[PDB]
Amino acid sequence: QVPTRKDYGSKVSLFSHLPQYSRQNSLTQFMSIPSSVIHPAMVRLGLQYSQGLVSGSNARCIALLRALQQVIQDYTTPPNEELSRDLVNKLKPYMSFLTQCRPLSASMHNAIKFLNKEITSVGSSKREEEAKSELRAAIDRYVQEKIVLAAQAISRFAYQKISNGDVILVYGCSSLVSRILQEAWTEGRRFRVVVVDSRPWLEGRHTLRSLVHAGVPASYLLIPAASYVLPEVSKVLLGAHALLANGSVMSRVGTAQLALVARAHNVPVLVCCETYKFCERVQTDAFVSNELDDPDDLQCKRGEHVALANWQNHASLRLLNLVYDVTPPELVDLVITELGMIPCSSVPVVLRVKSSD
Amino acid sequence: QVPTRKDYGSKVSLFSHLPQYSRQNSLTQFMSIPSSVIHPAMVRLGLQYSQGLVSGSNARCIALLRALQQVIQDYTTPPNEELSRDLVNKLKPYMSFLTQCRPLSASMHNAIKFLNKEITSVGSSKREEEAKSELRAAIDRYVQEKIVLAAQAISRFAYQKISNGDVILVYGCSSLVSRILQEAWTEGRRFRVVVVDSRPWLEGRHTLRSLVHAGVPASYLLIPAASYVLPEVSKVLLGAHALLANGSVMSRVGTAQLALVARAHNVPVLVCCETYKFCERVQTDAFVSNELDDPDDLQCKRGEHVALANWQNHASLRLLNLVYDVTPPELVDLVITELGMIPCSSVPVVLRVKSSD
Amino acid sequence: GSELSERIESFVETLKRGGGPRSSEEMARETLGLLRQIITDHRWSNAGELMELIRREGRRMTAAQPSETTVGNMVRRVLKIIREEYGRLHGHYAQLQSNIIEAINELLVELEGTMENIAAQALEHIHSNEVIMTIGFSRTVEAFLKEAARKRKFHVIVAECAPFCQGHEMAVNLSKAGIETTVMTDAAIFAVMSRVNKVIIGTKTILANGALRAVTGTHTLALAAKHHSTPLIVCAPMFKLSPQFPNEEDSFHKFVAPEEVLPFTEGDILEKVSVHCPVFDYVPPELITLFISNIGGNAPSYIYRLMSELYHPDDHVL
C-alpha cells in the first residue's frame, strides 16, 4: 500500500480542503525499489511529476499516455479473469499514486476516462495479446489526433485571425500558443509578441526562448506591469488548461487577472484549447478546486536578505501560491478549437457534440 | 456612577465591536429615583430614547436640545469656578448616559458639538444668569433655523423639482420627506407617492398615515417587492440620517438597496438632508460603524408558530437587524439642502462653507 | 371511471385553493401519478387521441393555478414521452401503453433522485470558512447546505422573505446541523452583501430565456450579487424547467391577500391606499452565474438546449 504524503506547511484556512505538498519530501522513499505495488513506469511518471520535470498540460497528458502504454504492454491477465474489468481495477492504484504525487490535470482526467471507457469496451471473447496492442493502437491514435491534429487545426484557425503588424500578449508557457505563433510567423505574418510572466515558476522564459529561436520579435515583462504595456497590445492570446461546462477558463493563476485588465483596456482576449481538455465540471472561483504548490517557492533570493526564509517560525504568517484560476466566460471573447472559433457560451455544446451525441 | 448596560444576545462576529442592547432591560433600574448623578431631564430623555418613543433624527435632536435647555436652565455655577469649563465638563456624563441608552445620531453629535463650542465661547467676565439664558436663546435660535427654516427651504427647492403626474417612491419614516410631499401637494402639484417599508420597525406606516391625512394618493408595499414597482416609479425620494465627508448617505438600512435597484431601473434618486446633519466622519460600509437594535424584534408573529421564538437556545443561530446602511455617492444623484441642489460630490465643500471658512 | 374523474377534480381544486402538496417535488410525483392513471383508465387506441385528452386536462390544470408551473411542465414531459414512444413504434397498442407506463416509471424513479443528486454535487461548490447567503426557504438549498456541512465549515446568511418569513424556519433548520447561521431582514441584503462569497438560492420556475421565477426580493439579491460580482448559484431540479418565455406568457406574479403586507387593523387608511403583495418576481439570466441540476452544473446559456432535450417545441403552448 502507498502511504499518504504529509501535507507540508501551514495551509490557508480557505484552502484547508486542498492538499499542500513539498517538492523535497517525495513519496517513493517508502516503496520497494523493484516496485511491485505500483508499476515501474507509473512510479517513474509520478516521480517525474512530483519533481516538476513535466509541467505542461499536453506534456503531462502525453507522458501519462506513454506510461499507460508501457503498463498495458507489460500487463498479463490472471487466470479465470477477464481483461475488461481486471485492467481497469488495477489501474486505479496507479491513478491514486499519481494524484498523490501531483493533482491530476483536466487533460489527464479526460485521458484516463477515455482509456477506462475503451478498456471496458474490449470484447470478452477476444484474446489477450491482440486486445493489448489494440489498446496500444487506440492510445496512439487518440494522442496523435487529439494533440497534433488539434494543434495543426487550431494553428490554421488562429493564423487566419492574426493580422500584420499587431502586438500579441501571451502569458506563461503553453505549447499550443507557442506553436500557433511559430506557424503564423513561418506562414508570412509579421507581428511582435509581448511575453508576460509571473513568479515563482517564471515559465514565461520558456515561450520567450521559443519565440527568440523562431526569430519572432519579442518583449518581456512580469504580470504587475501588464497594465503599462496593454495600451500597445493589439490582442491577448492565452493557453487554457481546462474549459468548464459554464465556459469559464481554468488556467494558470495569472490568466484571469490579465483578461480583466485587457477588458479594461478594450483588448480582445483569445484562448486556445482542444476539445479533450473540455470538462463537464464547473466552478465559480479559484477556491472550490485548485492546487497548492510548495509555498517555499515564494522565497525570493534578493542577494543577502531573504525575507521569507524562516516563514514557518512566524505563527501568524501564511504563504500561498495558487497554481490555477478561473476566468468568467464574459471576460473572454474567442475559444479556438478543432471545430473552429466559438464563444465561451458554446463550450458545453461542443462537449455534447464530443459526447457522441 | 452609571453602570454599563449588559450587551444582550449573541452578536455577529463582524459586529463584535458594536454594542447590542435589549429594550426590556433598561438602564435606570440602578439609579436613584430623585436622580442626582444624572440630571432629571437627561435621565428622562435617555429612558425615552431606550424605549424607542423618540425615533426620528430631527425628533431626537430636538428632544436633546430641549433636555439640554432644561439642564442649563437649572445649572448653577459652583464657587471659585467659571461656567465655560465647568458646564462642558458636567455635560459629558449626560452624553455618556445617552449614548449608553442608545448610540448618538449624527444630528445629536453635531448639536452637542455646537453646544460645547458655544459654551466654551461664553465670556469669563460675564455673570451667570444672562450667560445661562443667552445659551438658552442660542439653542432656541439654532434649533429654530436649522430645523424649521431648513425644512421650509428644502421644501421649496424640492417643490420646484417635483412635476405633475409623477410617481415618487419613499422609504420609511422621515419628517423632512413627509413635509416636502405635503407642501408640494398643497402648493398645487398632483402626484402619487409609493411608500416602501421594511421589517421589523414598519416605520413606513407613519408616512403612509401622514400622506393619507394630507389627501395624497398613496400606495404601500414592503422593500422586497420594490423591484416590482420601480417600473412605475418616476423618482425616488429618501431622507438621510447622515451625510459623510465622501458624499455617502448614512441612513436607514433599506436605503442603499433601494438606491441600487433604482439605479438598475434608471430611476433618479434624491436624498433630502440639512447641513447640520453633515459629518466630517466617513465610512465605506455598514460594518465599521453601525447600530444593532434588539434582535428579538426579528421574531414574526405568524399566528401559532413563531419560528425564531427561542433563537438563543440554538447555539449556531445568530440574529441581526442593522439600523443604518451607507449608499455610495455614485448611487445618488441629488442632495437638497438649504444651499439648494448639490451633487454628493459637493458635500465636503458645503461642510467647509458651514465651518465658517 | 368516476374515481379518476373525482381524483382529477380533487387535485384541481387542491391546486386552485391552496398549496397541496407543500413540496413541489411531491406535487410532481402526484401529477405524474395522476397522468399515469389517466393514460391507463381511458379508452384510447391511437396516440393522438391520448395526447389530445392529456392536453385538455393539462389546460384545465394550468388554468387552475398558472403560477404552479411544475404541473404544466411535467404534463409537457409526459407529452414528450408519448411523442418519443410513438416515434419509436412508428419511425403496437398494448405495447405502446405499457412502454409509456415504464417510461413514466423511470421518470418517477429518477424524480426522487434529483434531491440526492444535488446534495452529492453540493460538496465541490463549498470551501471551508465560506460565507453563503440565501433568501427565503428552499428544501433543495437547505439539503445542499447541510450536505456540504458534513465535511466543511461555513457561514450561511439567511435573508427572511417579507411577508412570508419562510427564511426563519430555514435558518432554524440550518442551525440544527450546526451551520453557523445569521438571520436578517431582506432590507439588509445590500448592506451585508459586501462580506458574502456566494449566493445560493432555489427557485419556483426556470424559463426558456434562462431567467427564473423565484420568491419576491430575490431579484434585488441578484442585483446586489452582480454589483459585488459574487457568483449566484441556483440549485433547481430539472422538473422546474418551463419552456414558456418571460413575456410571451400571462400571469407571471402571484398576488396574495394584502393582509400579509398591511393588516386589517390599520383602519380607514385601507380605503385610500393600494397595497400590493407579489409573491414571485422575475430574475433575468444576466444575474445568474451557474445552474445546479440533477445532471450537473450548467450555465444559463444552455437552458434552451435543456428545453430542446425535454419538451417538444410544438407543446410549448399546451
PDB file of C-alpha atoms in Angstrom, chain A residues 13-17 245-247 280-285 287-289 344-346 348-349 352, chain C residues 121 124-130 152 198 231 233 289-290 296-299 301-302 304-305 309:
ATOM      1  CA  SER A  13      -7.863  28.451   6.093  1.00  0.00           C
ATOM      2  CA  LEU A  14      -9.958  28.870   2.940  1.00  0.00           C
ATOM      3  CA  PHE A  15      -7.910  26.122   1.236  1.00  0.00           C
ATOM      4  CA  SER A  16      -7.914  23.656   4.147  1.00  0.00           C
ATOM      5  CA  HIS A  17      -9.719  21.144   1.906  1.00  0.00           C
ATOM      6  CA  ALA A 245     -19.187  23.492 -18.660  1.00  0.00           C
ATOM      7  CA  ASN A 246     -20.101  27.133 -17.972  1.00  0.00           C
ATOM      8  CA  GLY A 247     -17.449  28.404 -20.405  1.00  0.00           C
ATOM      9  CA  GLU A 280     -18.261  18.801 -17.669  1.00  0.00           C
ATOM     10  CA  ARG A 281     -17.122  20.005 -14.238  1.00  0.00           C
ATOM     11  CA  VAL A 282     -17.801  23.632 -13.328  1.00  0.00           C
ATOM     12  CA  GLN A 283     -16.648  26.116 -10.701  1.00  0.00           C
ATOM     13  CA  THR A 284     -17.125  29.815  -9.991  1.00  0.00           C
ATOM     14  CA  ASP A 285     -13.882  30.651  -8.158  1.00  0.00           C
ATOM     15  CA  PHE A 287     -11.207  28.346  -4.075  1.00  0.00           C
ATOM     16  CA  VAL A 288     -13.554  25.382  -4.584  1.00  0.00           C
ATOM     17  CA  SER A 289     -10.993  23.431  -6.636  1.00  0.00           C
ATOM     18  CA  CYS A 344     -17.281  30.550 -24.425  1.00  0.00           C
ATOM     19  CA  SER A 345     -21.081  30.317 -24.357  1.00  0.00           C
ATOM     20  CA  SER A 346     -20.775  27.388 -26.794  1.00  0.00           C
ATOM     21  CA  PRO A 348     -20.993  22.844 -23.343  1.00  0.00           C
ATOM     22  CA  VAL A 349     -22.461  22.473 -26.836  1.00  0.00           C
ATOM     23  CA  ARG A 352     -22.253  17.447 -26.126  1.00  0.00           C
TER      24      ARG A 352
ATOM     25  CA  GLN C 121     -22.965  17.585  -6.087  1.00  0.00           C
ATOM     26  CA  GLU C 124     -17.498  20.501  -4.790  1.00  0.00           C
ATOM     27  CA  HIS C 125     -19.019  24.009  -4.603  1.00  0.00           C
ATOM     28  CA  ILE C 126     -18.400  24.916  -0.930  1.00  0.00           C
ATOM     29  CA  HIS C 127     -14.976  25.536   0.609  1.00  0.00           C
ATOM     30  CA  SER C 128     -14.013  25.940   4.247  1.00  0.00           C
ATOM     31  CA  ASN C 129     -14.832  29.204   6.032  1.00  0.00           C
ATOM     32  CA  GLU C 130     -17.069  30.424   3.202  1.00  0.00           C
ATOM     33  CA  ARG C 152     -16.941  21.722   5.558  1.00  0.00           C
ATOM     34  CA  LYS C 198     -21.563  33.047  -2.810  1.00  0.00           C
ATOM     35  CA  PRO C 231     -21.286  34.196  -8.046  1.00  0.00           C
ATOM     36  CA  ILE C 233     -25.843  29.742  -7.764  1.00  0.00           C
ATOM     37  CA  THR C 289     -23.716  32.613 -12.643  1.00  0.00           C
ATOM     38  CA  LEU C 290     -24.412  28.866 -12.633  1.00  0.00           C
ATOM     39  CA  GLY C 296     -24.744  18.617 -13.221  1.00  0.00           C
ATOM     40  CA  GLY C 297     -23.835  22.260 -13.380  1.00  0.00           C
ATOM     41  CA  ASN C 298     -24.809  24.319 -16.404  1.00  0.00           C
ATOM     42  CA  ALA C 299     -24.659  27.950 -17.437  1.00  0.00           C
ATOM     43  CA  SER C 301     -26.944  29.936 -21.708  1.00  0.00           C
ATOM     44  CA  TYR C 302     -27.654  26.164 -22.006  1.00  0.00           C
ATOM     45  CA  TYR C 304     -32.570  26.363 -24.096  1.00  0.00           C
ATOM     46  CA  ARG C 305     -30.725  23.189 -25.090  1.00  0.00           C
ATOM     47  CA  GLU C 309     -33.901  17.907 -24.686  1.00  0.00           C
TER      48      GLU C 309
END
